[PDB]
Amino acid sequence: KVFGRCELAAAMKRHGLDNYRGYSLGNWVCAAKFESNFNTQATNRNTDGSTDYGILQINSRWWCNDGRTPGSRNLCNIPCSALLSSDITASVNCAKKIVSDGNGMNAWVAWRNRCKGTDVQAWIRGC
């Protein structure tokens, strides 16, 4: 599915992402907008052979097993296919692991380049 902004904010809140590890909800909405355009089926192939999956574009080099990323790890203990459903639970639970791993939300390329250092609370305005 492709979420609307406030619909996704509400779903992320129901999944406990709001203020997770101190990151307010707007951070997560901004990250999803710029990673995937709020699209649970988004995929992106990288020139290192890894792929980014799902609404938070979680990458197969470290976080999920797709069977095709040489020498990679699977720290979320899931197949990457689980990140390509319309239910965001697997993405949220893996994001919670990622964000607790030692670099916070800096693991997300789109967040660190396009969200961090902006007024991210604006992403939940009107919701």
Backbone CA torsion sign across 118, 1, 94, 22: positive
Does residue 118 bind Cl ion (CB under 5 A)? no
- Least distance from Na ion to the Cβ atom of residue 73, Å: 5
- Least distance from Na ion to the Cβ atom of residue 47, Å: 16
Told to judge if 119 belongs to the known catalytic residues of this protein, a careful annotator would answer no
Site of interaction with Na ion (CB under 5 A): 60, 65, 69, 72, 74
- From the list Cl ion, Na ion, none, which binds 59 (C-beta under 5 to 8 Å, kind-based)? none
C-alpha to C-alpha distance for 90 and 119, rounded to whole angstroms: 27
Cα dihedral: 123, 30, 82, 22 (round 10)? -90
Known binding residues for substrate: 101
- From the list Na ion, Cl ion, none, which binds 122 (C-beta under 5 to 8 Å, kind-based)? Cl ion
Residues 6+ apart with CB under 8 A from 96: 16, 17, 20, 21
Does residue 122 bind Cl ion (CB under 5 A)? yes
Told to judge if 35 belongs to the known catalytic residues of this protein, a careful annotator would answer yes
- From the list Na ion, Cl ion, none, which binds 60 (C-beta under 5 to 8 Å, kind-based)? Na ion
CA distances to 122, 125, 126 from 54, rounded to whole Å, are 23, 24, 25
Annotated active-site residue in 7, 18, 52, 87: 52
The residues assigned a catalytic role are 35, 52
